[PDB]
């Protein structure tokens, strides 16, 4: 009985650690990034050309 | 170098570099040509808005998916879908990364060939492997027996696998979907005098769909309290204003997934295929199957839905089984997170499809060895 | 702020969920035994109201 | 919407909470039985061994 | 050093250390390669399950026993077999320590010199003797006469030995043993409506008639009870649900041991080939034979079987002579109890066939004096 349930732990714990490196790879390293602005509030240059 | 994991689907595409948690740039899969005649000059106005562009957009344009079932009808737009995904949702060119798409279980040869030459002759990428929908969801949960029930948004499909070793005779391919549902809630919706017609509408009558419909735990006390109170009806503010009331249609839309009748199919409900598919498996799998039922796919995601399908197995099934549904939070992405996880293992770095062995046997490499 | 709680309150979930998934595994094997010593017990029952017999005789 | 979803997330933890003590309060249950189950076997063993004495004699 | 005393069987291989009471390692002899595709990558998947680990994963297995009827009809896979038992299951090298086969009567000679050479040349053992599997059986009852019935799961055999003199004209083989009463029963089941076909549920079959049939007393009686009440149907779970009820085919599935003309064998039963067999025999041992029959072997152990014989034979027999039938508790394993018994004597310790002496006259040796 014992052994059983520790090679069946065995595989699940295996299991799980490959899915568990898959998170470790690759989980925010490139993941969210603003990239945004502050919406220059206290920009006060307009423009008068509008050929564009 | 690192994998491209894309992913086609039908209806919302998603790719991403191999070994992430979640695809970096997901997008509906739509190319609308404009319809109207165009007045301005030098508006810059281009002939196909693909992707995320064209949902900005529907205004003036005809929106029209390239994939219908699975299978992909068109190859222009999806050959065009393709190069947007590449080159301006990862900004990689394809000429150093290999990429593993994925195709539904049973669909046709041709779709499968054509793919894979569009892909190394086209985009001309180093090599490219294709894996069934379901071996992918099944990877994510990581798991290995389980029979794995992915409502996509184009086809649901059932495959079960023990212990790794998958079982063609029982994959039970029903065609039914996300796409089915959005068209018969905008046919249901004509009861209370909301016409929605137009291919840009749609797309509205979608997004009810995604944030208002519930799958019913009993459908019969469901449709009697829904026609005596009136603690059911939900209001939802459409994209100009005169907000609309939805009152039993709420649960009468996804209903149709566990009674296909209501849009006219013949086949039985996604409660029913998937005990038929456990059926026809070897009688020693049964109750490990039983116990590791997995739900994928986006359909999958109505508030209520792993409950009615344990319910109704648990009404088929034997009384001494336990049936138990899995039912992860990042049910949507499932299967791409199951693309990143088997394109990271170095047991699998040698089943690509190299492009040499491409250039000896030609575009039906794919149904050899390399599967 | 709001996406930092969300986050943890995940992660307090996954681990939780290993937890109940161990228990249950243990709640198996539990079972299991159980049906084996019922089992023990009828053999046992069987054989010695056979020797019984045989005694009697 | 993050909000929303965080008051979703604890709702699950909280679910898998209570589902794990029901679980580990059945694995205690279990395991006083198990050890009830060996003791039984044990006395059963006994038992076999003094009848096949006898019935040699 | 001590010696290994294995016992092949059909049906389980009984192995274990010389001068203990029961077998280290019991496990049934099958050997099943898996017969579906396997989709999971890496799982590290064998190409053959052998002994109890492929009475686990049958659900997708295809097990094929290596010996038919005593004879071997496989060799690779009985040599896969051993060396299983040896490395795995015992986790003793075979180069130090000797070995004690056992074998059938009457079994075909080629079947004998090729186990030799296997273990002479393959594992490597110091020395190896091979034994009659009823002379065991003998010997663990702590008798020197006496008439044994070694019905086993391959054959059933049926040697009569006076005084530690074996009398080779009066041993009578049948090869109706346990596997032909599965099959019997796995073909009278279908009575009801319940099929077994896969090589898979002939071990749910066997489960079943291990636990619920038993020998009827009086044939024709329990036929006519099981046919009027209901107090025989004892019901039983599959491995999946689906209680079954086991009505009057549960006396007669081993009631075929009596009467084989039901599964169309033309001989007489175990009942009357024991009769026969002492017959042979000279006119002033019989009274002894009468007195010790003995019972050994794994289907000897059906509830109520040591009372049927008595009545048959005392039905046929004289009416002045006693009819005894021995039959230990320790039936199923009393060959290899007898076997470590025997290679537990110091008198018996220069019987072995030593290596060198292989060498010197081939594999025939094992015909030659060291028998
Ligand atoms: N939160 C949600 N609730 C209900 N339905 C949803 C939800 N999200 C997506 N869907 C449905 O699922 C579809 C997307 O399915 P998806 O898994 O992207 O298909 P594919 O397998 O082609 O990727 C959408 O068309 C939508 O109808
Ligand atoms: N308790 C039991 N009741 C009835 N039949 C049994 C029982 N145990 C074993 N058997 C039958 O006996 C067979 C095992 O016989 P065994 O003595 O192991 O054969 P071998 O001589 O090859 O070792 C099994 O196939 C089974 O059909
Ligand atoms: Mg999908
Ligand atoms: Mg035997």
Redesign the interface.
């Given at each position: 009985?014992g052994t059983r349930?520790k090679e069946?732990?065995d595989?699940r714990a295996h299991?799980?650690q490959?899915?568990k490196?898959?998170?470790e790879?690759?989980?925010?390293?490139?993941?969210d990034w603003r990239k945004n602005i502050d919406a220059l509030s206290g920009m006060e240059g307009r423009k008068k050309k509008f050929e564009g | 170098t690192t994998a491209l994991v894309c992913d086609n689907g039908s209806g919302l595409v998603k790719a991403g570099?191999?070994?992430?948690?979640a695809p970096?740039a997901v997008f509906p899969s739509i190319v609308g040509r404009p319809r109207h005649q165009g007045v301005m000059v030098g508006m810059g106005q281009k002939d196909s808005y693909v992707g995320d562009e064209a949902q900005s957009k529907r205004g003036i344009l005809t929106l029209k998916y390239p994939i219908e079932h699975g299978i992909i009808t068109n190859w222009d737009d999806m050959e065009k879908i393709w190069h947007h995904t590449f080159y301006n949702e990862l900004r990689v060119a394809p000429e150093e990364h290999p990429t593993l798409l994925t195709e539904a279980p049973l669909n046709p040869k041709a779709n499968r060939e054509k793919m894979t030459q569009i892909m190394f002759e086209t985009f001309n990428v180093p090599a490219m492997y294709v894996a069934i929908q379901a071996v992918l969801s099944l990877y994510?949960s990581?798991?290995?027996t389980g029979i794995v029930l992915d409502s996509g948004d184009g086809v649901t499909h059932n495959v079960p696998i023990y212990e790794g070793y998958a079982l063609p005779h029982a994959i039970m391919r029903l065609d039914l979907a996300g796409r089915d549902l959005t068209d018969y809630l905008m046919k249901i919706l004509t009861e209370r005098g909301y016409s929605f017609v137009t291919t840009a509408e749609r797309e509205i009558v979608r997004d009810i769909k995604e944030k208002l419909c519930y799958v019913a735990l009993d459908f019969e006390n469901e449709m009697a309290t829904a026609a005596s109170s009136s603690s059911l009806e939900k209001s939802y503010e459409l994209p100009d204003g005169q907000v609309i009331t939805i009152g039993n249609e709420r649960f009468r839309c996804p209903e149709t997934l566990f009674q296909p009748s209501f849009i006219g199919m013949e086949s039985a409900g996604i409660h029913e295929t998937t005990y038929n598919s456990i059926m026809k498996c070897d009688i020693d799998i049964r109750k490990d199957l039983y116990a590791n039922n997995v739900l994928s796919g986006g359909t999958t995601m109505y508030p209520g839905i792993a409950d009615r399908m344990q319910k109704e197995i648990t009404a088929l099934a034997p009384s001494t089984m336990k049936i138990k549904i899995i039912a992860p939070p990042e049910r949507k992405y499932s299967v791409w997170?199951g693309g990143?996880?088997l394109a990271?293992?170095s047991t699998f770095q040698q089943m690509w499809i190299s492009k040499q062995e491409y250039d000896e046997a030609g575009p039906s490499i794919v149904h050899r060895k390399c599967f | 702020e709001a996406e930092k709680a969300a986050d943890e309150s995940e992660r307090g979930m996954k681990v939780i969920e290993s937890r109940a998934q161990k228990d249950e595994?243990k709640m198996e094997?539990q079972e299991?035994?159980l049906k084996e010593a019922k089992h023990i017990a009828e053999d046992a029952d069987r054989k010695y109201e056979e020797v019984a017999r045989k005694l009697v005789i």
């Open positions: 009985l349930a069946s732990l595989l299991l799980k490959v899915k490196e898959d998170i790879k690759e989980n925010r390293e490139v993941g | 570099f191999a070994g992430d948690d970096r994510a990581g798991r290995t997170i990143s996880i990271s293992l | 595994e094997i299991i035994q």
